[PDB]
Amino acid sequence: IAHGDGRRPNKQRQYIVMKACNKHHIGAEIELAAADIELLFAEKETPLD
Amino acid sequence: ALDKSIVVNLTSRLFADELAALQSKIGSVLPLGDCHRLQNIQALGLGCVCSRETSPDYIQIMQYLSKCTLAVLEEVRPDSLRLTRMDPSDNLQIKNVYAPFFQWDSNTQLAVLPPLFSRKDSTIVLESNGFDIVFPMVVPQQLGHAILQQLLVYHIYSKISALDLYTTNVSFMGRTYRLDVDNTDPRTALRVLDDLSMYLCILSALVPRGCLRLLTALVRHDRHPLTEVFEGVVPDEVTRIDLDQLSVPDDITRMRVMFSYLQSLSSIFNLGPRLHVYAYSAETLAASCWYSPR
Amino acid sequence: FTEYAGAIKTITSALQFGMDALERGLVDTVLAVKLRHAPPVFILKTLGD
Amino acid sequence: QAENAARLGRQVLGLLPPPTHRVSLTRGPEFARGVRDLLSKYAASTRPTVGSLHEALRQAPFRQPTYGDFLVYSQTFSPQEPLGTFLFSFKQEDNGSSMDMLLTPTSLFMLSGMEAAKAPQTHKVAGVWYGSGSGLADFIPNLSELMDTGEFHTLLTPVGPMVQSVHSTFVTKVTSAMKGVGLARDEPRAHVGLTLPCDMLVDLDESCPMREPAGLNVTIYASLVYLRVNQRPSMALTFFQSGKGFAEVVAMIKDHFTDVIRTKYIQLRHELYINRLVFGAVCTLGTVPFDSHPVHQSLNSLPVLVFANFEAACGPWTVFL
């Protein structure tokens, strides 16, 4: 504001603000049984398989 | 190039009374505090250091004067005072309306002094705003020095009283004047005198002996126009120092240190800023001068 | 060219600043004129009757 | 390749002193049209633009420093400096054609030989730019005798801040600046300010306030104090920064050196030598504008101030006491 009192008029001012990024990491575990993976690649030819 | 102008905002309309005094002194030098276009009236006075209820100390006021920027008036409008500015190193018109009147000419020399003859004549009061304005005085250097000579002599001989014709009168070719001392704070005028007691007793230790023997050959019979201070009688002290033999290379080392401490007395006898007038008009009372802060 | 044209953006925005800080000077001084001539309610209410 | 040569046709003819204002009388009132830089109030509009005010920005003052060219032994001028230090030119006798001796304030600390706690920070830094101090003292065999009679302030001429140093093995070329703001060489469009160590500088205007006027001018003063330490003569150089006028600062400097004046002159109840009476001297190193903030820096640490818009104006030495 430019005013007519005796105090000092202000020059132009700027601010430079620097924000950052917080990083987050999530982990969940999954167990596959070895008796369950073994028949996934096998050959099936009977109605029980 | 550069601009220099100060227009002073003011919160009340002035009366016709105080407008007549400010119109009469339209070209006048007065200091002010800050270096801006817009300005309060409480900076324009020299009365921020020289008030009525506080006892003024003219050395401290003069000590104050070499800090401030200085200014010359242009107009007195009924609301706002309009002033121009003095900066190094600029030629400018200056016009003396200063009431203890002295005469200038082309190629004279000037300096700015506090009001030391009539404070009531040189300060006008503004009852409209409640703040009073003090004008300083501009004096040529010869009377610019000779007032500060008499003011330092006064504060030595007011302390000894713990009468007036020898202490408070400034002498000059053709005129005599009265310094204005009723209430002075001597303490800022005495730290100047405390440093004079430092230099002057060092200057009494390195006195050359050949220059004292020169006076013992001089003032006894050879009477000159400018040696009438001693009135024809030698002092009792000068006969006591010249008992030694004169030798040239002793005084060579003395007169160099005598030379170098007289360089230091510039610092204790300083005036304010100095004004070198190159052209002065007589019937118009204006001049032209370049401002030099030292 | 991008040094020149990025310095003419500085000096305009330093001078749009100069005018638009003076339009605040109107709104300041006009409001300050009103407050110098605005006596409070309790003084003026009984004088209004 | 004449496109390279026409660039100098642009830049030399554009960069000249302004010519003398001389117009013949038969042309008439055309000379008043050639007075543009004296005009100082320019019209503003509702929305002013650079195209409106490119004429108001065009008229500029005429400012130029006067450089000095110094050719220095590379033993004295340390090869790395912060490029804005203040300089002095010690001078004893013209022995050769052009071999010049220059003294930075860190180099003049080592010739002094004062105690560590007088300047606790620069003693570490000035002891790694140099040896024990006898790498410089062999040029001046009169350092014991110039301090007794007190001639050492008469032999220094303050010159101004650095602008450029082109360093070789045996000889260092140093270009300093007098009379104003020196143009920076390596960075274009830039100005070299003056850099002082924070240890040497003694500020003078400092208050609670517990009111003082503002102004346009604050002046850096140098000082150089003759003293005795360990019954050996030695000097002390400090700096001062105030805009109080010369009549106050001489009284303000004496209050700073009150203790050093007393501890010296306890000696001369016994021996009164008139050569010993000279104590100090004060120069004027040039002005600083008011309200320019001195910016702190740190180098290797060595805290070092810097002053923007420093313009130089050398003065003589006046002997205070």
Per-residue three-class SS string for chain D = CHHHHHHHHHHHHHCCCCCCCCCCHHHCCCHHHHCCCCCCCCCCCCCCCHHHHCCCCCCCCCCCCEEEEEEEECCCCCCCCCCCCCCEEECCCCCCCCCEEECCCCHHHHHHCCCHHHCCCHHHHHHHHCCCCCCCCCCCCCCCHHHHHCCHHHCEEECCCEEEEEECCCEEEEEEEECCCCECCCCCCCECCECCECCCEEECCCCCCCCCCCCCEEEEEEEEEEEEECCEEEEEEEEEEECCCHHHHHHHHHHHCHHHHHHHHCHHHCCCCHHHHCCEEEEEEEEEECCCCCCCEEECCEEECCECCCECCCCCCECCC
A27 to chain B, any CB pair closer than 8 A? The answer is no
- Taking an 8 Å cut-off on Cβ atoms, the answer to whether A5 and B40 are in contact is yes
**Position B294 in a domain:** yes
- Does B67 contact D246 at a Cβ distance shorter than 8 Å? no
- The Cα D108–Cα D152 span in angstroms is 12
Q: Please indicate, yes or no, if residue B164 is contained in any of the structural domains.
A: yes
Domain count along chain B: 3
B103 and B203 part of one domain: no
What is the distance in angstroms between the Cα of C6 and the nearest Cα belonging to chain D?
Answer: 13
**In which domain, by residue range, is B256 found?**
194-268
Cβ-nearest to B9 among A4, A8, A9? A4
Distances B101 to B96, B140, D274, D315 between C-alpha atoms, Å: 9, 11, 48, 36
In a domain, B287, yes or no: yes
Task: Check CB contact under 8 Å for A4 and C29.
Answer: yes
B180, B208, B243 - which closes a domain:
B180
Contacts of B195 in chain D (CB under 8 A): 251, 254
Do B70 and B101 share a structural domain? yes
CB pairs A-C closer than 8 Å: 15
Neighbours of chain D (3+ CB pairs under 8 A): B, C
| B185 within domain boundaries | no
In angstroms, the CA D212 to CA B63 distance is: 12
Q: Does C7 touch chain D (CB under 8 A)?
A: no
The shortest C-alpha distance from D47 to chain C (Å) reads 8
Residues of chain D contacting residue C12, judged by C-beta atoms under 8 Å apart = 49-50
Co-location of B122 and B213 in the same domain: no
| CB-based contact B9 A9, cutoff 8 Å | no
Question: Do B124 and B203 reside in the same domain of the chain?
Answer: no
C-alpha dist (Å) from residue B112 to B71, B127, B269, D245:
12, 27, 14, 14
Q: Are B226 and B212 part of one and the same domain?
A: yes
CA separation for the pair C28, C22 (Å, rounded): 10
Please check whether residue B147 lies inside any domain of the structure.
yes
Question: Is the Cβ–Cβ distance between D183 and D176 less than 8 Å?
Answer: no
Chains that touch C (3 or more CB pairs under 8 A): A, D
Q: Is residue B188 part of a domain?
A: no
Chain A contacts in chain B segment 19-48 (CB below 8 A): 34, 36, 38-40, 42-43
The residue of chain B with its CA nearest to that of A9 is: B36
CB contact under 8 A, A2 and C25: yes
Q: Based on the fold, state whether residues B13 and B127 are members of the same structural domain.
A: yes
Nearest to C12 among D44, D49, D57 (CB): D49
Nearest CA in chain B to A8: B36
* Phi (first) and psi of residue B75, to 5 degrees: -135, 160
- CA angle, residues A3, A6, A9, in degrees to nearest 5: 55
Q: How far apart are the first and last CA of chain B?
A: 24
From A18's Cα to the closest Cα of chain C, the distance in A is 21
Give the list of residues 6+ apart from residue D281 with CB closer than 8 angstroms, or none: D153, D223, D224, D317, D318, D319, D320
Nearest to D283 by CA among D238, D218, D236: D238
On whether both B15 and B113 belong to a single domain, the answer is yes
Query: Is B189 part of a structural domain of the chain?
Result: no
CB-based contact B87:B53 (threshold 8 Å) = no
Contacts of C29 in chain A (CB under 8 A): 3-4
Other Cβ atoms less than 10 A from the Cβ of D125: the count is 19
The rounded radius of gyration (Å) of the Cα atoms in chain D is 24
Q: What is the resolution of this structure in A?
A: 3.8
What is the rounded distance in angstroms from the CA atom of residue B259 to the CA atom of residue D278? 11
Residues B262 and B275 in one domain: no
- Is B276 in the same domain as B264? no
Q: Chain C within 8 Å of D52 (Cβ-Cβ)?
A: no
Q: Are residues B103 and B237 in the same domain?
A: no
Mark which of B117, B150, B180 sits at the end of a domain. Answer: B180
> Residue B276 domain-assigned?
yes
Contacts of C8 in chain D (CB under 8 A): 50
Q: What b/e sequence results for D244-272 when a residue is b if at least 16 CB atoms lie within 10 Å of its CB, and e otherwise?
A: bbbbbbbbebbeebeebeeebeeeeeeee
Same domain, B103 and B161: no
In A, what residues contact C, Cβ < 8 A?
1-4, 12
CA distances from D214 to D72, D127, D243 (A): 41, 40, 9
Residues B210 and B114 in one domain: no
Residue from A21, D195, D251, D243 nearest B68 by CA: D243
